[PDB]
């Protein structure tokens, strides 16, 4: 299949189980792991990293929610994706 580019690697299909985050991470944030598997967070908005769950950035207050009908979830490998229940789709792109 070298004549075609590598296939798109999609998020988990809409139908099936999802490890949803009850409260989504704020837009522009990412979760990662250290080499020993310690969880930490990246704020791409102000280009910082921190141990503290956003749910040097001051995060007192509630952040922008997903639009109605959407949820944030995480793959087994820790990759965040977005579930749109309105049209039964999933996407790597944050709709906020």
Author numbering: 134 to 188, 207 to 247
What does the literature reporting this entry say, word for word?
WW domains organize molecular assemblies by binding to short, proline rich peptide motifs each with ~4–6 residues. The type I WW domains bind to a consensus ‘PPxY’ motif (where P is proline, x is any amino acid and Y is tyrosine, also known as PY-motif) with very modest affinities (with Kd in the range of a few to a few tens of µM). To achieve this goal, we determined the high resolustion structures of 7 representative WW tandem/target complexes, and measured the binding constants of >100 WW domain tandems or isolated WW domains binding to known or previously unknown targets. In this study, we discovered that WW tandems, but not individual WW domains, can bind to target proteins with extremely high affinity and with very high sequence specificity.
We were able to obtain high diffraction quality crystals when the Dendrin PY23 sequence was fused to either the N- or C-termini of the YAP WW tandem. We solved the structures of these two versions of the complex. First, the inter-domain linker of the YAP WW tandem is unstructured and there is no C-terminal helix following YAP WW2. This is supported by the two versions of the complex structures solved, in which the inter-domain orientations are obviously different. Second, the Dendrin PY23 binds to the YAP WW tandem in a parallel orientation (i.e. PY2 binds to WW1 and PY3 binds to WW2), instead of the antiparallel binding orientation observed for the KIBRA/MAGI2 WW tandems. This is again likely attributed by the lack of inter-domain interactions between the two WW domains of YAP so that each domain can freely choose its more preferred PY-motif. In contrast, the coupling between WW1 and WW2 in YAP is minimal. For example, the binding of YAP WW tandem to Dendrin PY23 is only a few tens tighter than the isolated WW domains, and this relatively low synergism likely originates from the very closely spaced PY-motifs of Dendrin PY23.
